[model samples]
Target: VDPAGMSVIRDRNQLFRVAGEVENTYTLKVINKTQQVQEYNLDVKGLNDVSWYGKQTIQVEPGEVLNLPMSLGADPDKLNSAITTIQFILTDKSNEFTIEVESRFIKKL
Candidate 1:
């Protein structure tokens, strides 16, 4: 987590006009942060008018960092102008050691 307590870097003030499409990119930097090796399975979901276009799961070794990029496209014309939330979850095998993050964005016409 950074100064904002966010595990990933994202755009908090994304704006798009009606009938307009915009691609939002989020980069998740996963670090071991521990002494032992850890394995994690990542998944992303919950977006309005957004589609993902990349790998979903990743593995990281001890003291290693991995970059997971997610692409989201928005169409405000077909949706409402409010706070939109996207959720991401990371788990190890049996759903244990799971971490979740939520990102919010706004729409404009």
Candidate 2:
């Protein structure tokens, strides 16, 4: 089980999921590969007690990235079986991707 990462979605820009503890913080990262600053609108889904720990939508510079931390409500008894999803819709209509947080993922930094 691995956390949702860029490597998996880089090729297809597909939806992916990451796993984390209910008492711990989970992070979602978005990278801008365009030449100009682009605006992105994103929504969270697939889990409960989820909210943006970072900017929901903002202009990101070219070659830069944004990391949005998500606060997950802790339910000790249910955490093992819980899931969360973060989906992104680029305002420029250039790309779209999703990060899933339901079953298996973590981070060190």
Candidate 3:
């Protein structure tokens, strides 16, 4: 559990694909380990001309698990290389706790 008493899960050391106009999908499982309801914001970092799909902010009941489906799409031409490092972050609404996970991003051929 993180400082917020929550668990953030993703596919570790996984290579995800990104394409022009095509969104690469990912499923995030967030577990609320605390005793009270919580709100958080999900964000992606280190991509150019990127847009997010799915609910960026969410509310979770105490001790509940939230399965969040999020997608990321980018302008292929704007990428500096065929492979890049990306991070998925989740922060509580109050900025009291945060979690960061890393993944590899590859350009679709």
Candidate scoring better on lDDT of 2 and 3: 3
lDDT of each: 0.59, 0.43, 0.70
- Runs off by more than 4 Å, candidate 1: 1-6, 12-21, 33-38, 75-78
- Deviating ranges (above 4 Å) for candidate 2: 1-24, 48-52, 74-109
**Candidate 3: where are CA atoms >4 Å away?**
1-20
Span of 10 residues, lowest total lDDT, candidate 3:
5-14
Expressed as tens digits, the lDDT of each residue in 1-109 for candidate 2 is 1111221132122132333433334455666776676666554444444434445566678777676654433333443353333343233334544444333222122
- Candidate 1 vs candidate 3: the lDDT winner is 3
**lDDT by residue for model 3 over 7-54, one digit each (tens)?**
334434434553445356677777776888889888888887677888
RMSD (Cα, Å) for all candidates, in order, is 4.9, 9.7, 3.5
The positional error of residue 96 in candidate 3, measured at the CA in angstroms, is: 0.6
lDDT of 1 by residue, 36-61 (tens): 56567666666556656565666566
Clash number for model 2? Answer: 7
Count of steric clashes across candidates, in order: 0, 7, 0
Error of 1 at 63 (Å): 2.0
Q: Which of candidates 1 and 2 reaches a greater TM-score?
A: 1
